Scaffold this active site. Structure first.
Site, PDB file in Angstrom:
ATOM      1  N   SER A 153       0.860  -1.180   0.000  1.00 36.11           N
ATOM      2  CA  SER A 153       0.000   0.000   0.000  1.00 36.11           C
ATOM      3  C   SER A 153       0.895   1.228   0.000  1.00 36.11           C
ATOM      4  O   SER A 153       1.591   1.484   0.984  1.00 36.11           O
ATOM      5  CB  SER A 153      -0.934   0.003   1.204  1.00 36.11           C
ATOM      6  N   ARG A 154       0.880   1.981  -1.100  1.00 38.98           N
ATOM      7  CA  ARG A 154       1.734   3.160  -1.190  1.00 38.98           C
ATOM      8  C   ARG A 154       1.338   4.209  -0.160  1.00 38.98           C
ATOM      9  O   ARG A 154       2.206   4.857   0.438  1.00 38.98           O
ATOM     10  CB  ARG A 154       1.679   3.743  -2.601  1.00 38.98           C
ATOM     11  N   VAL A 155       0.036   4.397   0.059  1.00 37.10           N
ATOM     12  CA  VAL A 155      -0.415   5.408   1.010  1.00 37.10           C
ATOM     13  C   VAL A 155       0.042   5.047   2.417  1.00 37.10           C
ATOM     14  O   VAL A 155       0.855   5.754   3.024  1.00 37.10           O
ATOM     15  CB  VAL A 155      -1.942   5.572   0.933  1.00 37.10           C
TER      16      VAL A 155
END
Lengths: 59, 132, 118, 261, 85, 118
Positions: free
Chosen positions: E33-35
């Protein structure tokens, strides 16, 4: 010396003598295996007929 | 075979293996075992003393804290000791006086423990005695 | 002759020690951190802190991590890793040189964190 | 799923290499101990050859295994001999040594295991640890009163040519009155027979445990070695399959793209 | 590939996990998950900061326990911690 | 809430065990059943028995297996599987678990194998 009366066995007496004799010496003689000779991690728990290994006391 | 062979192979590290010698005098359980050459078929449990293994060269003295020296009929002295000792490292002053006395603290334990440690009570005196 | 004589000397050790740290990466988890020799345990205690010290908070990664960023120089970082290898600060704690600045900046990290223990 | 198989085999190979390193580390110590222990036992064996020390005739059952849980045939062969002894001498007391032998001995007869001591194969065979184990054995339930005791112990010839081979022990009664014990004399006051029995047990046990630890370290270098070979073969096969699959996928992609054009 | 290059990340629910009984089947190691936690209620964050590292360690000991043998204290503790988590 | 909480748990345990067997198959082939855990060995043995219990004699397939077909009752099957994972017949023979009905026919086959195989 007092192995006759109430010790464990001849091996117990000679081994305690080994421990003392090593104590009658410095690090320049006592190799690493003398440590395991002193640090005995063998945990003796005599079993039973009903498989009762009571307590693994270090040997 | 002429002479006398010794097998000093303790459960820690084997020292001698059938080497020829002129004397292997040692402190047996019933007395002082001065087997010089050949000896006779008799094997004795040993008492803490000095094993001055007199080879064809000089007699190296090592205060040995126990063993059994099997005098095999082939002039073979199978000395399966429990400890090894040099002619120089087995000789000291402070290490042979304070260690036993500190161990006398362990003698303050219960009856079976004191019965065991009674051997250690005089164990260190032998090395300082045989160090010369 | 292109990166600095010392920088190659340290990096060679730094590459090797980390490779040894990578080499000691498998062994330490097998039987424990005991098997290393005095030089090896020194490497395990020099590199696993240096590999931890490899980290550095970013001057732009402000929004997520929250640690203010670090921007030491070449004359800083090069001699920094060597001193980490050299053991001149070998007494530093585990997180002392990790997520830190230069070598001179790894001193305060333990010193200010050691205030909580005393 | 071929990719997961190849990578899992690779991980198993890395773990096997780590186990091989651990095996080398333990085998150094095991060999170091066995070197002196063999000579130590040969010293009293010279007496047992000097006096034919055949022991005739509450008889313990024993085995050889260090503090590891089986390696190829390290624990299995000893377990077979243990089951054979249990069948032959159901009333034979068992000495449960280490862990794998301890578990195998607890399996057959609950009334046989008289001791359950673990972790004997912690390191090289130490003189004091083996001696204390024997002294406890020489004190537990009158194992000296055990008229005979057979050591079903590993006999590693060179690498793994062994099983838990059975041998006799010269006891207190069998030492003094041996037929050729007339050769080597004893003293009434010195009480030789008991001490000879105890020390013969000591030397035999130390030598056998050192040989067994060396042989199981071999089982950690001669059973995992077979496992390392299996991993190499599987890894070569899987690498072939994956390299062929990637190439064929690229080729089929080119063929599909041109066939579209 | 295009979605994983455009999307925010993935919860790559591999079939082995769902077969391994873990329903739902977010294969944590294969997840991404980049966020991240910056888009999260910090109440979760205080425990997730350790949860992620514990799952990571469990990933480090999965092979060791796959061998099915003994090890040091750290390894066994990590295996128990990871399985429990 | 479809076929029963017990049924759901039985299927979950069975699938977990079989997945464990498949997952450990690699190390099993590479090293052997002894080289792994006794817990792992026990699970592998139970899983092998379960997989060998997966087949059954179908009424029209009697052409192939030769046995008259067996239709395992849903509740009976669930109970049999829960038992087999729970070791209520873990000592029955593996070859007496294939091509039979429920665990009752499994025990009957184990007795028949005790009579014949010996």
């Amino acid at each position: 010396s007092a192995w006759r009366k109430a010790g464990i066995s001849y091996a117990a007496y000679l081994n305690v003598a080994a421990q003392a004799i090593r104590s009658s010496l410095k690090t320049e003689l006592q190799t690493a295996s003398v440590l395991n000779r002193s640090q005995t991690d063998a945990f003796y728990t005599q079993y039973k007929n009903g498989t009762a290994a009571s307590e693994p006391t270090p040997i | 075979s002429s002479g006398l062979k010794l097998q000093f192979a303790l459960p820690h590290e084997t020292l001698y293996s059938g080497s020829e010698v002129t004397q292997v005098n040692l402190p047996a359980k019933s007395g002082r075992i001065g087997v010089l050459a050949n000896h006779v078929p008799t094997v004795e449990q040993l008492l803490p003393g000095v094993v001055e293994v007199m080879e064809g060269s000089n007699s190296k003295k090592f205060f040995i804290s126990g063993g059994f020296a099997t005098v095999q009929p082939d002039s073979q002295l199978c000395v399966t000791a429990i400890e090894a000792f040099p002619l120089e490292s087995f000789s000291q002053e402070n290490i042979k006086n304070l260690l036993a006395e500190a161990k006398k603290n362990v003698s303050s334990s219960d009856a079976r423990e004191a019965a065991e440690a009674a051997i250690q009570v005089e164990v260190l005196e032998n090395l300082q005695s045989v160090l010369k | 002759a292109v990166v600095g004589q010392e920088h190659y000397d340290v990096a060679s050790k730094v590459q090797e020690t980390l490779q040894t740290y990578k080499s000691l990466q498998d062994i330490i988890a097998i039987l424990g951190m005991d098997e290393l020799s005095e030089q090896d345990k020194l490497t395990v205690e020099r590199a696993r802190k240096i590999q931890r010290f490899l980290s550095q908070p970013f001057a732009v990664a402000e929004v997520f991590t929250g640690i203010p960023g670090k921007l030491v120089r070449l004359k800083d970082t090069v001699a920094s890793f060597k001193a980490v290898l050299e053991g001149k600060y070998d007494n530093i704690p585990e997180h002392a040189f990790y997520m830190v600045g230069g070598i001179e900046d790894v001193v305060a990290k333990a010193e200010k964190l050691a205030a909580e223990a005393n | 799923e071929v990719e997961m198989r190849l990578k899992s085999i690779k991980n198993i190979e890395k773990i096997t290499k780590t186990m091989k390193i651990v095996a080398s580390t333990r085998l150094s110590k095991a060999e170091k101990a066995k070197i002196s222990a063999k000579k130590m036992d040969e010293a009293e064996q010279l007496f047992y050859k000097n006096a034919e020390t055949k022991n005739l005739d509450k008889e313990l059952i024993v085995a050889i295994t260090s503090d590891k849980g089986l390696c190829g045939s390290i624990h299995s062969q000893l377990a077979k001999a243990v089951r054979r002894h249990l069948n032959d001498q159901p009333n034979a007391d068992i000495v449960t040594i280490g862990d794998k032998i301890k578990m195998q001995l607890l399996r057959t007869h609950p009334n046989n295991i008289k001791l359950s001591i673990n972790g004997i194969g912690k390191d090289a065979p130490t003189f004091q640890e083996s001696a204390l184990i024997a002294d406890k054995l020489l004190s537990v339930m009158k194992a000296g009163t055990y008229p005979k005791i057979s050591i079903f112990y590993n006999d590693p010839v060179s690498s793994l040519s062994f099983e838990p081979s059975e041998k006799p022990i010269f006891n207190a009664k069998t030492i003094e009155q041996s037929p050729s014990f007339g050769k080597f004399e004893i003293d009434t006051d010195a009480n030789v027979p008991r001490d000879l029995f105890e020390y013969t047990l000591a030397n035999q046990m130390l030598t056998a445990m050192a040989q067994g630890y060396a042989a199981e370290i071999s089982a950690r270098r001669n059973a995992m070695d077979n496992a390392s070979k299996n991993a190499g073969d599987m890894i070569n096969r899987y690498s072939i399959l994956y390299n062929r699959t990637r190439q064929a996928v690229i080729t089929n992609e080119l063929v599909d793209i041109i066939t579209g054009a | 590939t295009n979605v994983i290059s455009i999307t925010d990340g993935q919860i790559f629910l591999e079939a082995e996990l769902f077969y391994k009984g873990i329903r739902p089947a977010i294969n944590v190691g294969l997840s991404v998950s980049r966020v991240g936690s910056a888009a999260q209620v910090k109440a979760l964050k205080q425990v997730a900061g350790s949860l992620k590292l514990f799952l990571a360690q469990y990933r480090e000991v999965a092979a060791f326990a796959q061998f099915g043998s003994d090890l040091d204290a750290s390894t066994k503790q990590t295996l128990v911690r990871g399985e429990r988590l």
